[PDB]
Amino acid sequence: HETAAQRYSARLLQAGYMADYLISGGTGYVPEDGLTAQQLFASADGLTYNDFLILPGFIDFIADEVDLTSALTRKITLKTPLISSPMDTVTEADMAIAMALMGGIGFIHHNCTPEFQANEVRKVKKFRDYPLASKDSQKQLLCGAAVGTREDDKYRLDLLTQAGVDVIVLDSSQGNSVYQIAMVHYIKQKYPHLQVIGGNVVTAAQAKNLIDAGVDGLRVGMEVMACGRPQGTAVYKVAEYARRFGVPIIADGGIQTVGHVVKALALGASTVMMGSLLAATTEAPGSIQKFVPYLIAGIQHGCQDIGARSLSVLRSMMYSGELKFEKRTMSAQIEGGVH
Template structure:
């Protein structure tokens, strides 16, 4: 056809109609047919049901392998990531998710200095070895020591001589708890050296033995010149035992994602976030099928190197996914207009229903071994399971976590109940809040809305419920691993009456 563009994927040829219209690709059609999905109509979660198969799984509790790849070498034991929204993910949510095997993306709507601090809070929350432990000078006051411990939410500080850089003592909350003379110098109340220490390279198991033998809670690692090179704490060792599924980096710290946009000094921001410890960078924009995002991915890789792990989105077509994959994205975020506080389909009228969007983009992404992040439309366990069954490696959630204790903002009381605010990043209220920060951004026609949501308690309760539903779904399909579940699951279309039939009867 004249004007058509020819795309090649692993040697297979696809025709894309001029103007970026959807290709009738053999790969996409084959994958949809394999999943029991039509190619001529777009479906969402309520339009399909998962078929059950003969199963040798005795019960959902027997299933333990729910590992899935987020991007490159980052594997989650819990295939859930929290949305990069200002009312969903800052350090508290990211810490809670990582401890349970998922990952949080710190949102991009804070000043870069605040985002860096949020990343550092996550990396310091649980550590195998703390590389740069907080410290204080022996000449500082007790008041300064107390303030530092309160601000950093820690129970002690190493005391280091500013001239020699040597460890000279340690001051803990017990040393200052009942101290009324706050002007005293730290040197007057601290525990002086020599302290129980260990050399660099001490393993966590060796540290455990030393801590137990000496009945201490903090073990400084010092070199031959008595300079501090790290710290191992009993608290962190206990957290490793408490959270066996936690998502950790090679140093034992919790993993965390950071988000940037496609404008301004985004490369400089990414560099600062990576230096702070971010494990993956999400480049996020509402219109991901764009030259701007394509160039942003390429420029970020060229500037910071191929080692940078990049997730990018959002797109909802195979062509959009392919564009980002070829630009260098290590994971692609799928979904336009499906969010609970999004009006993109209602306003501009854009957005492919989510089951079809996930499946079609997965068909292309599989050929490149690039994982898909399903983003939007998740209202409960069934939607979560169906997103994974359609091909997503992980599922991003905002609505499901809205109202949780770990989300930013304080709960408030109204109508005799406790609530928190949840809003879309394109809502009028959110745009005005950015204007209040003197960002000078013109208020656009809103494509999102704010909502009050009931206070839900801890995010762990939400995650445990979702994972229980997933293991149950896996047992119905007859699969022992999440990877097998994605391959084996099949859908069947259902009528709205069929969907309503499946809801519990209400009196």
């Protein structure tokens, strides 16, 4: 990507404003200020999205020009980073249709008899004011489904395959298990065309065992539980590990505002799974058709303030140390407003 110094110096040639080029080429000096993402997380304290800010960059573009295309899996790409969660309160076929037309995807839930989930998937597949639409090679909408890791889910998975599903999410609170790895190996052997998203993970050790099982995406996220992780740290650690293998990450939970979506995206999650913010809308079992454009314009203004032309540019600035972060103690969270 073109760094802020390169973009500034290149556009300073557009009016009447040597040896500097011979000193260090395009790396034409910026004052050192703020932490890199590596320096922010190189400490014992686990961070949530409220504990840090992204520092503003250099703006050379209109916010409506910001590209939001992102990877869901190794083979599937969306035009918008927004996914509707596989919750029974959220995603059935009308919600999955709404999401796919907008350029996201929905994962249909599995608090269903197996034929009912297959019917809702079939209904999404058989469905010019939607430019961004999530469509397959046959121009049908993209559909996700949820599956458990019990034995009877091997039958549910066949019906979802006959319904023409594009991507499966393995639904578990702790995805790093013999049961889920046995399921990923089964799906890859029996359905070699089908994309699988692994479990829930919060550490790079969990992501390793699932990436080694041949999974294509990962879902990051985890009062009385004793296990878990702070969600900003979990998204950053799992994404930094999985990025070594070209596996995309889904940030799931801890998301309440546009600011949390821009932070999750900036930390390496390629897509964000809206859990409840969608619930309580016209489609769930406002209107999506009216509310996702609001989120999308929010993400584009966020990327514009950061000075990133694209979400892949944003993640490339984060891993290279160009994007800078600051930690907020509680009084700094209070003076912005959070609680």
